[PDB]
Design a protein around this nucleic acid. Structure first.
Length: 224
DNA sequence: AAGCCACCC
DNA sequence: TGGGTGGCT
């Protein structure tokens, strides 16, 4: 049971609008790792908007963690919507907090929402901190921290640290894990929108799982 | 906005 | 494999 009145209110309001018919397919979509109330994103954001109609910033970590601790997945999704509203107050001191979120109730929906936006932004401002985290994440054998190392630069475009990206990928290219092979393909394909020659040269000269290579070049292969 | 693509199998 | 699909940059 949540301490914070905001979370108590969100819990009651979400629960009052649950849809058991939708909960089953939503749960199986996520391989039944989580219970669902059965509330999709548009309705979930409207219900959150209801309750906000914003807690002090000193409460934001308390609120997020309380939501993270609740069983139904919509509360973690709502927690990430809430964290967006505190964007300007999130900085390098929050990396360990974000790490905890990544490795707790982990799946692609939370991790892909946390990493290219919040960690991406932090490391753009503090690139001198990357070596304190990225190698650690790679060495952790936690696939979500590994996916975090791969994807924190996903949205960088011209800001991409190419040599860092390629080093991270080389460290993880031998992973058997689908979510790692796919993340490698994804980030290379995305970066190829900005710097296609360099992604082509990388893929032609460095070992990748076939899934990763195929995904990387599927929109530039017709140019070479 | 919506063009793109995570996920699913 | 690539269509179905819901949501993000």
């Amino acid at each position: 049971v949540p301490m914070h009145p905001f979370v108590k209110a969100l819990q009651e309001h979400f629960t009052a609008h649950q849809n058991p018919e939708k909960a089953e397919p939503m749960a199986r979509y996520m391989k039944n790792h989580f219970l669902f109330l059965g509330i999709q994103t548009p309705e979930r954001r409207q219900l959150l908007k209801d309750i906000i109609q914003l807690p002090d910033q000193k409460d934001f970590q308390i609120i997020i963690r309380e939501l993270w601790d609740l069983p139904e997945r919509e509360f973690q999704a709502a927690a990430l919507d809430i964290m967006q509203k505190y964007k300007k107050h999130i900085n390098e001191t929050h990396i360990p907090f974000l790490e905890e979120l990544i490795v707790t109730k982990s799946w692609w929906d939370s991790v892909d929402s946390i990493v290219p936006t919040f960690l991406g932004d932090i490391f753009l401002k503090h690139p001198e901190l990357i070596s304190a985290y990225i190698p650690k994440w790679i060495a952790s054998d936690n696939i979500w921290l590994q996916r975090a190392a791969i994807l924190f630069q996903l949205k960088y475009k011209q800001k991409m640290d190419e040599e860092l990206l390629f080093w991270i990928i080389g460290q993880l290219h031998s992973s058997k894990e689908f979510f790692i092979q796919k993340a490698i393909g994804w980030v290379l394909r995305e970066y190829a929108k900005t710097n296609p020659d360099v992604v082509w040269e990388y893929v032609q000269n460095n070992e990748l799982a076939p899934l990763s290579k195929r995904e990387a070049i599927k929109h530039i292969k017709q140019n070479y």
